[PDB]
């Protein structure tokens, strides 16, 4: 019944869904803001339409009514939201399903249950999956202080709608707890409107484990193993690996089983990610992401399962094991290990601020074990400050984790992006580290390793020679 799909996103995820749609034989519709007119994803689709005319480009990509209007006038049967803009938005999915278009996502009750952190924690408690010992709902500042008294420091302040570590603060004493509560309140009203701050127990050096969940309309729910995303800077993911090579297979199986049984209790559909906090052979639920994730690529590499294709086919109502063709849970293969690196415009010698400018050189590596999901990184592309800093996702996969590390080091040295600064030297430093190589990296690994921020001087002799030749 589906013949045409719109992607309400941009960048590399739009191209990823376009490639999946072309493999599934469907037509593709792109949307783009005026400031995103030179994006690759605009020209990778059968039809492209300008959206959000006159708005800011981020607000243009959040123009819900314009997106449904474009999808209706283009004859698109469905809308894939991708991630990061309206994938977790309850209002957008509600309007999409009210317009008669198929929403490639979970159900509305899944969206508004897993959107807010305290309701997701309540659902996990109903599924008896253990979580961080925290407040039973959004407490006040005084209640947060009371929790800091009875359960004792360390505690962590977290907002119930925070994203990307925005509404999340840390506290060590009483006054810093007040400051963190005030800052989380300001960030919650500023970006999300309502402040619903809770307080959770802080764990010393945890391991961030994410489990990928696929569920269909018939109720078959499987897990595509797990991902280790512990390597983070300021609670933002830097390098993600799959599977958790630093953990025992039985413990990973327990984490995966808890995730799939949580999703079975909530009756989850489509692709989803369950985030878990691992500390010395016990796990705690944090959130469920009701969308495809950025790091789904390494899960596809280690399992062989096309996550976006299965997402679209589940949105078609197809059976997980009969029509899509996925095997049983015990038959899901583990094809080696994979590592994902996000090459961004963040300058590690400038406090990881996003550099802007014109890319004058782009060379991408290839070969065995290398997967590229490029965004907008071609030569001549003018990097704008409007959108996110991502240039190209690169994934290296191999039978052994050591060979994956070696391939990713080769890739990061083979990559050449000139004109804008990149986080490539930081990624090289992290890859060379023995904690990451052993796979026992924690969430505090980057913040407690100052040697990651020592960068060798690069000659860059081609750029300087061309500059002098132009000068003379």
């Amino acid at each position: 019944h589906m013949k045409k799909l719109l992607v309400a996103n941009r960048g590399e995820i739009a191209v990823r869904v376009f490639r999946a749609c072309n493999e599934l034989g469907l037509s593709t519709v792109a949307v783009y803001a005026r400031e995103d007119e030179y994006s690759v994803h605009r020209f990778k689709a059968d039809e492209s339409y300008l959206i959000g005319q006159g708005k800011k480009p981020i607000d243009a990509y959040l123009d819900i009514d314009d997106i449904i209007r474009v999808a209706l006038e283009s004859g698109a049967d469905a809308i894939h939201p991708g991630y990061g803009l309206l994938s977790e938005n309850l209002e957008f999915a509600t309007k999409v399903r009210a317009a008669g278009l198929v929403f490639v996502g979970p159900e509305l009750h899944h969206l508004d249950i897993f959107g807010d952190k305290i309701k997701a924690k309540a659902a996990a408690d109903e599924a008896k999956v253990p979580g961080i010992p925290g407040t039973n709902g959004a407490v006040d500042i005084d209640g947060a202080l009371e929790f800091a008294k009875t359960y004792g420091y360390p505690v962590m302040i977290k907002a119930a709608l925070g994203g990307g570590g925005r509404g999340m603060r840390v506290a060590r004493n009483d006054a810093e707890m007040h400051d963190g509560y005030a800052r989380a309140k300001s960030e919650a009203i500023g970006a999300f409107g309502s402040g619903e701050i809770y307080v959770e127990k802080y764990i010393e050096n945890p391991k961030h484990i994410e489990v990928q969940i696929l569920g269909d309309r018939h109720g078959n729910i499987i897990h595509l193993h797990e991902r280790d995303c512990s390597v983070q800077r300021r609670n933002q993911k830097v390098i993600e690996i799959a599977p958790a090579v630093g953990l025992s297979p039985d413990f990973r199986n327990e984490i995966c089983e808890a995730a799939v049984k949580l999703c079975k209790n909530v009756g989850y559909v489509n692709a989803g990610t369950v985030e878990f906090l691992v500390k010395d052979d016990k796990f705690y639920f944090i959130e469920v992401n009701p969308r495809v994730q950025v790091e789904h690529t390494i899960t596809e590499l280690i399992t062989g399962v096309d996550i976006v294709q299965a997402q679209i086919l589940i949105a078609q109502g197809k059976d997980l094991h009969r029509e899509i063709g996925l095997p049983a849970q015990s038959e899901i293969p583990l094809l080696g290990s994979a590592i994902q690196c996000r090459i961004t415009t963040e300058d590690p010698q400038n406090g990881f601020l996003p550099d802007t400018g014109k890319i004058d050189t782009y060379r991408s590596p290839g070969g065995f074990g290398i997967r590229l999901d490029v965004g907008n990184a071609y030569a001549g592309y003018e990097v704008t400050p409007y959108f996110d800093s991502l240039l190209v996702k690169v994934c290296t996969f191999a039978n052994e984790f050591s060979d994956s590390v070696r391939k990713m080091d080769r890739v990061l040295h083979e990559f050449r992006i000139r004109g804008v600064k990149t986080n490539i030297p930081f990624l090289i430093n992290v890859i060379a580290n023995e904690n990451f190589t052993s796979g026992q990296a924690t969430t505090t690994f980057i913040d407690n390793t100052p040697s990651l921020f020592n960068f060798p001087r690069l000659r860059d002799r081609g750029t300087k020679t061309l500059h002098y030749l132009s000068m003379i």
Binding site: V29, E37, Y38, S39, V40, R42, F43, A45, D46, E47, S48, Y49, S74, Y378, G380, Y381
Partner: protein, 95 residues
């Protein structure tokens, strides 16, 4: 007979309108077909662009079909070489 001859001359099977216009204006229709094979549907360009081309640093948008719009920008016009050719530095669709 005319339709088979035209299907030989042009690279496809013509419609009735193409056959009848080939009857009245044979060389004009064949020259039009050659210009279609060389320059494409120039009817979609706007008239100042159609008659005058592009200036330096000009941005034009050519809607070639529904949902497809070519973003064309002329960045530089190269000097003519010894063979008389000029290299024109376009930015088509960002590239």
């Amino acid at each position: 007979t005319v339709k088979a001859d035209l299907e030989q001359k042009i690279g496809y099977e013509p419609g009735d309108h193409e056959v009848i216009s080939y009857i009245m204006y044979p060389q004009v229709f064949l020259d039009y077909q050659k210009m279609q094979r060389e320059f494409g549907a120039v009817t979609l360009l706007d008239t100042p662009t159609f008659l005058h081309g592009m200036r330096l640093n000009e941005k034009i948008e050519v809607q070639i079909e529904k949902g497809k719009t070519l973003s064309i920008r002329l960045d530089e016009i190269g000097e003519p070489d010894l063979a008389g050719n000029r290299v024109l530095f376009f930015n088509l669709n960002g590239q």
